[PDB]
């Protein structure tokens, strides 16, 4: 314990304190908008589910950001990805958020499919979503069924991870219990299972 | 300590050596921010010299300032302006080292020695943004600025 | 009789509200909504929209292209990519974008940057059916 | 007293919010303000060696910044602007400069003859 | 197949270019939310 | 000297250049390697007790890494390795040791022999 | 202080007690990285002993280095590898606690005495992470590693 | 440090002037939280005097918390309850202001010397909301409470 040292360490910590308090109040407003811009995006995103969630569906046969330093967020979609990579067939790695490339590349470096970047910097809006769905058809992957997880927001002080399923193949989509409905054209569903995907993804992001 | 402390009054130019610099391999470990001359006056060394020294002194000081933001709270969280003043700074900071001729025994590189005006020029450049492309180590332990453009390819391919 | 919900990523226009019938641009002409209609699922093709109130009010709205879904029970919703109403449409200000679209049809002997274009034609064009 | 007061206060606020200089390139346009004023006022307090200024000269160059007029000039240029601006008045308006001194205060009238010289000179400076 | 399919163009893109006209069809009193919204702030890392 | 004469100013920079990029991000083409090396190198000066080594053998192992014949091995093994590759090149080549021990240098001769005795081992274990 | 300071010279084995530890209810309050013996030596204790020792002594002193970042940024900023090094270490930390047959009065708990074998064993296991599935407490204040795994159940 | 430490043994109360407070134009600039007295025992002054004071204290800390919310979260982010205790607190802050007679020769403002009983009830009221109706800045710089009442009316 030298005076000189205490003083050093003091200065170091006194900054970490200011940088933190500052950065807190950045995220603070950043959150207070991404919440106003959410009130809508929920009502909406939710109704996109009104369907699926009134006719469950079996099948015979990752969302976050790049900026870390938010603690709990990025682990909780791994406590449901390395823990659902051993439960599950064979789906490949499709998640947004470079921070998943980090916390999932030394341990699952193969099944990689398509990762994204610049998530979180600017408040994602619809286009952001679609441009991921638009790239899950373009980059033709053999779709079967869906695993997309994200962190539902409960409170500023708490949220809750969530697993939602979207049926990636219209084949599995037009299953049995879905006959209660008319005009089941393989082409007005090709145009609704497609717009519900970039309608879940959008809800998951926001 | 009252010994070196009282010695300072009796000087016209003081070169102060830093353990923390030496420990980083940057010999001669001169603290570019504790070293001082009486003739560092633009009306003595010229506005080019002066303005250039002080510019180096500044950027090194600014880098020292970002130093406990970055190394504990994510580097790329810096400005564009700042990853830039870090980049250049670390270059400047290393280009400040010199293989000494009496230190070949330690260093491993043949001695060196730079004429004042090639020093001013060297830094003026680095400062000006002219080498933001060459990687760090190229300035570590070379003589005249060009000898870094040398190590710039030697380290390349 | 049904609870009607219609909004867009940006804003919510009518939340689970008492609606007798509504009116939508479909990828097959128009398609009203029976106060107790058969279950069906169809997309959207650029065009206007009107709702039949619980007090009998009918204010007009507009859709770009989204999802409409009539669920088994008494619940139907509309999911628009965009939805302009009230005034924000500034008269024929975009009936000009109608030109920098038809015109373009020609300036592309391609098919990629062609199929896309024509859409903007009927898109923009349909718009003229406002003011 | 009638410029220094303000300056003090402003630098004081600038100080309270300095942290967000860095991790604040996107924050309430309200405090984005204080940062700007702050760094500018700060530039005004820089001074070369062996170059003591007359009080009326001082009041002038501070007046410039402390009243806004310098807010839309790149900090870099400030020490150069004050350098030329000072010179301009010292040879030209030795008039109501030398008057700011002997009268002691900044006259309802001198306020205006200043705003005229500052804003119109900057205008042409950064042009 | 319809008048935008055929080539290999997902409904997405359809729905998309649509908006690109509704937003173009506005003024200055109402537009402060349509510029803010929309955008492809994502990247495409296959690097 | 030939295996470790500028490696003392290297493990005072690979030091500082793994304390700067401690965190999991990205770093250019130059400083990706220095770390990719050092970790293995340190596993080298890890030494038992009451068991000196003769200078010849020291040059043996130091050579292994410094010339980059370990630059592709998981550190958690770099000890079961050395403990073999050094009793393997005492049982086989008292030859090479003989020279370096005596003239106290590694002529392109001595060096050449090494350049294979090594290689003749990495491929015989992992590859 | 000269007194304790000088005395160290004179010992063959030392056990150093830290208030820091005791204040975390870790009795006996032994500093694992400051207590030493001039016979911790494989030739004397057999390099299974010497190996589990320096293996505990390592993970501990690895935990101890993270001690600073965990205090300022929190557990989350910890790399995945490191999140573990903690959890394991923290168990070791806890499994060195041992309810003495004296303070049966302060611990209330029944006074255990653990034989070299099961000492060396239990840690080895903890170290090889057989137990990353058990709560921390499970190892606090027990005898052999059984009472540990055993405890872990009574909770569940 | 010994000097202060020895002195404090003999101290019965503190009065802390704040450049801080003085800036917010409160005179005298006593920090009403930092300043304290050893005879704030209900035992020694009132149970009324005590309870009231503890009230003015509590509300004042409570406020200084919402002040961190209101600052980065929302100005209406408080219930009609908090929106209230911010109302009341901002008013008490002001009633702890006061003109001195030794500053009449200079403010013009007449100086108030406020007997104890009056001061105790003054805050007693403002607390149980007997002025939520009245404005705010009519609480700033007055004698007894009935000057703040007769100061809002005089805002015609």
Ordered DSSP codes for F14-55: TTTTTSSS-SSS---SSTTHHHHHHHHHHHHH---SS----H
Which residue in C65, C94, C115 is closest to E18 by CB distance?
Answer: C65
**A148/A127 Cα distance (integer angstroms):** 18
For chains A and C, what is the number of CB pairs under 8 angstroms?
73
Resolution for the entry shown, Å: 3.2
SS3 string, E1-47, reads CCCCCCCCCCHHHHHHHHHHHHCCCCCCCCCCCCCCCCCCCCCCECC
Chains C and A touch (3+ CB pairs under 8 A): yes
Residue pair H104/H111 in contact (Cβ under 8 Å)? The answer is yes
Q: What does the longest C-alpha to C-alpha distance in chain C come to?
A: 53
**A47/C49 Cα distance (integer angstroms):** 19
SS3 string, chain A, reads CCHHHHHHHHHHHHHHHHHHHHHHHHHHHHHHHHHHCHHHHHHHHHHHHHCCCCCCCCCCCCCCCCCCCCCHHHHCCCCCCCCCCCCCCCCCEECCCHHHHHCCCCCCCCCEEEECCCECCECCCHHHHHHHHHHHHCCCCCCCCCCEEEECCCECCECCEEEECCCCCHHHHCCCCCCCCCCCCCCCCCCCHHHHHHHHHHHHHC
Query: Which residue has tokens 């190394």?
Result: B71
User: Who contacts D64 (Cβ-Cβ below 8 Å, separation ≥6)?
Assistant: D44, D70, D82, D85, D118
Torsion of CA A11, A12, A17, A23, to 10 degrees: 130
Are C65 and C21 part of one and the same domain? Answer: yes
**G13/F24 Cα distance (integer angstroms):** 42
- Structural domains in chain F, CATH included, are 1-127 (1.20.150.20)
The domain of C105 spans: 90-131
**Helical residues (DSSP H) of B12-115, grouped into ranges:** 19-22, 42-65, 67-70, 80-95
CA distances from H32 to A140, H18, H21, H71 (A): 69, 10, 10, 22
List the structure tokens of E1: 């197949």
Strand partners, H17: H30
First-to-last alpha carbon distance for chain E, in angstroms, is 34
Buried b (16+ CB within 10 A) or exposed e, H36-53: eeeeeeeeebeeebbebb
Q: How many CB atoms lie within 10 A of CB A92?
A: 12
CA distances from A97 to A77, A93, C120, D6 (A): 11, 12, 33, 48
Say if residue B28 is preceded by a cis peptide, omega within 30 of 0: yes
Residue range E1-47, CATH number: 1.10.1620.20
Three-state DSSP class for B78? coil
List the structure tokens of C10: 């940006």
Give the residue from D79, D67, D84 showing the smallest Cα distance to D125: D84
**B95/B126 Cα distance (integer angstroms):** 9
Q: What angle do CA E16, E18, E20 make, to 5 degrees?
A: 80
Identify all chain A residues contacting D24, using CB atoms and an 8 Å cutoff: 22, 26
**Helical residues (DSSP H) of D1-127, grouped into ranges:** 4-16, 29-44, 55-66, 75-91, 95-103, 108-125
Chains C and G touch (3+ CB pairs under 8 A): no
Q: What is the experimental method? A: X-ray
User: Who contacts B20 (Cβ-Cβ below 8 Å, separation ≥6)?
Assistant: none
**A156/A178 Cα distance (integer angstroms):** 38
List the structure tokens of B35: 């070293």
Chain H residues in contact with chain A using a Cβ-Cβ cutoff of 8 Å:
72-74
Residue pair A181/A159 in contact (Cβ under 8 Å)? The answer is no
List the structure tokens of H71: 């600052």
Residue pair G57/G85 in contact (Cβ under 8 Å)? The answer is no
Count of domains observed in chain C: 2
Three-state DSSP class for C4? strand
List the structure tokens of A201: 């993804």
Residue of D nearest to A24 (CA): D23
Number of H-type helices and E-type strands within chain H: 7, 0
DSSP G85-149: HHHHHHHHHHHT----SSTTTTT-S------HHHHHHHHHHHHTTS-TTS-SGGGSS-SSHHHHH
Kind of pairing, strands C2-7 and B13-14? unpaired
User: Do the annotations mark residue D22 as ligand-binding?
Assistant: no
Domain B40-157 has CATH 3.40.50.2000: no
Query: Which residue has tokens 């030392």?
Result: G14
Query: Would you put residue H67 in left (φ > 0), alpha (ψ -120 to 50) or beta?
Result: alpha
Q: Regarding the domain delimited by A26-206, which CATH topology (the fold level of the hierarchy) does it fall under? A: Pyruvate Kinase; Chain: A, domain 1 (3.40.1380)
First-to-last alpha carbon distance for chain A, in angstroms, is 50
Buried b (16+ CB within 10 A) or exposed e, A58-83: ebeebbbbbbbbeeebbbbbbebbee
How far is the alpha carbon of A127 from chain E, nearest alpha carbon, in Å? Answer: 5
Say if residue C11 is preceded by a cis peptide, omega within 30 of 0: no
List the structure tokens of H8: 């404090």
**C47/C23 Cα distance (integer angstroms):** 10
Residue pair H57/H127 in contact (Cβ under 8 Å)? The answer is no
Kind of pairing, strands C67-71 and C75-79? antiparallel
Say if residue D15 is preceded by a cis peptide, omega within 30 of 0: no
List the structure tokens of H89: 């607190």
**Helical residues (DSSP H) of chain H, grouped into ranges:** 2-9, 19-23, 48-69, 82-95, 104-107, 116-127, 149-152
**A95/A80 Cα distance (integer angstroms):** 12
**G32/A178 Cα distance (integer angstroms):** 65
Half-sphere exposure of G132 (CA within 13 A, CB side): 11
Q: Cβ–Cβ of A16/B68 closer than 8 Å? A: yes
Are C85 and C95 part of one and the same domain? Answer: no
List the structure tokens of D76: 């870099």
Residue D38 gets which letter from DSSP?
Answer: H
**G83/A75 Cα distance (integer angstroms):** 11
Residue D53 gets which letter from DSSP?
Answer: P
Give the residue from C66, C99, C78 showing the smallest Cα distance to C19: C78
Are C108 and C79 part of one and the same domain? Answer: no
Identify all chain D residues contacting A24, using CB atoms and an 8 Å cutoff: none
Residue B17 gets which letter from DSSP?
Answer: B
**H155/G45 Cα distance (integer angstroms):** 91
Buried b (16+ CB within 10 A) or exposed e, C47-58: bbbebbeeeeee
Residue C29 gets which letter from DSSP?
Answer: S
Residue range H40-156, CATH number: 1.10.1140.10
Q: Cβ–Cβ of C64/E22 closer than 8 Å? A: yes
**Burial category of E20 from C-beta neighbours within 10 Å (exposed 0-12, middle 13-18, buried 19 and up):** middle
Which residue in B41, B69, B79 is closest to D25 by CB distance?
Answer: B79
After which residues is chain C discontinuous, taking C to N > 2.5 Å? none
Query: Would you put residue A183 in left (φ > 0), alpha (ψ -120 to 50) or beta?
Result: left
Are C15 and C62 part of one and the same domain? Answer: yes
């Amino acid at each position: 314990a030298t005076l000189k040292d205490i003083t050093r360490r003091l200065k170091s910590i006194k900054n970490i304190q200011k940088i933190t308090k500052s950065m807190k109040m950045v995220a603070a407003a950043k959150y207070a908008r991404a919440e106003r811009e959410l009130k809508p995006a929920r009502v909406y995103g939710v109704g996109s589910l009104a369907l699926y969630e009134k006719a469950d569906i079996k099948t015979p046969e990752g969302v976050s950001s790049d900026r870390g330093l938010c603690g709990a967020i990025h682990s909780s979609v791994a406590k449901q990805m390395k823990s659902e990579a051993a439960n599950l067939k064979e789906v490949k790695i499709i998640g947004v958020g470079d921070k998943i490339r980090s916390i999932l590349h030394r341990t699952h470096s193969d099944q990689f499919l398509v990762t994204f970047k610049e998530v979180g910097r600017r408040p994602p809006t619809f286009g952001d979503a679609s441009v991921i769905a638009l790239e899950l058809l373009n980059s033709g992957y053999e779709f079967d069924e869906g695993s997309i997880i994200f962190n539902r927001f409960r409170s500023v002080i708490s949220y809750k991870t969530e697993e939602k399923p979207i049926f990636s193949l219209d084949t599995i989509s037009s299953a049995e219990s879905m006959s209660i409905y008319d005009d089941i054209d393989a082409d007005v569903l090709r145009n609704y299972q497609e717009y519900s995907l970039a309608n879940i993804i959008y809800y998951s992001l926001k | 300590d009252p010994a070196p402390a009282t010695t300072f009054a009796h000087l016209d130019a003081t070169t102060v050596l830093s353990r923390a610099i030496a420990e980083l391999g940057i010999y001669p470990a001169v603290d570019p921010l504790d070293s001082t001359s009486r003739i560092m006056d633009p009306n003595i060394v010229g506005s080019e010299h002066y303005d250039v020294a002080r510019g180096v002194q500044k950027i090194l000081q600014d880098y020292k300032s970002l130093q406990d933001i970055i190394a504990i709270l994510g580097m790329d969280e810096l400005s564009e302006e700042d990853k830039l003043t870090v980049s250049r700074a670390r270059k400047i900071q290393r280009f400040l080292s010199q293989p000494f001729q009496v230190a070949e025994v330690f260093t491993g590189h043949l001695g060196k020695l730079v004429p004042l005006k090639e020093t001013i020029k060297g830094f003026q450049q680095i400062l000006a943004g002219e080498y933001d492309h060459l990687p760090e180590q190229a300035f570590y332990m070379v003589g005249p600025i060009e000898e870094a453009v040398a190590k710039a390819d030697k380290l390349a391919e | 009789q049904m609870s009607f919900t219609f909004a867009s990523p940006t804003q919510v226009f009518f939340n689970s509200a008492n609606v007798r019938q509504v009116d939508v641009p479909t990828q097959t002409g128009a398609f009203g909504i029976l106060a107790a209609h058969v279950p069906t699922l169809q997309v959207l093709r650029p065009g206007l929209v009107v709702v039949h109130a619980e007090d009998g009010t009918t204010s007009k709205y507009f859709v770009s292209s989204g999802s409409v879904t009539v669920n088994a029970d008494s619940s139907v919703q509309l999911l628009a990519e965009e939805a302009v109403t009230l005034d924000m449409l500034d008269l024929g200000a975009a009936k000009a974008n109608l030109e920098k679209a038809q015109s373009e049809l020609l300036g592309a002997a391609d098919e990629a940057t062609r199929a896309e274009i024509q859409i903007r034609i009927e898109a923009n064009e349909a718009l003229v059916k406002a003011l | 007293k009638q410029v220094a007061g303000t300056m003090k206060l402003e630098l004081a606020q600038y100080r309270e919010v300095a942290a967000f200089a860095q991790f604040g390139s996107d924050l309430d346009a309200a405090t984005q303000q204080l940062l700007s004023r702050g760094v500018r006022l700060t530039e005004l307090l820089k001074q070369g060696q062996y170059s003591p200024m007359a009080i009326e000269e001082q009041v002038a160059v501070i007046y410039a910044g402390v009243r806004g007029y310098l807010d839309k000039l790149e900090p870099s240029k400030i020490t150069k602007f004050e350098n030329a601006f000072l010179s301009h008045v010292i040879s030209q308006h030795q008039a109501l400069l030398g008057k700011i001194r002997t009268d002691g205060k900044i006259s309802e009238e001198s306020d205006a003859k200043l705003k005229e010289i500052v804003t119109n000179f900057l205008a042409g400076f950064e042009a | 197949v319809a008048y935008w399919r055929q080539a290999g163009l997902s409904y997405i893109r359809y729905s998309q270019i649509c908006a690109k006209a509704v937003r173009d069809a506005l003024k200055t009193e109402f537009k402060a939310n349509a510029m803010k919204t929309s955008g492809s702030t994502i990247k495409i890392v296959k690097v």
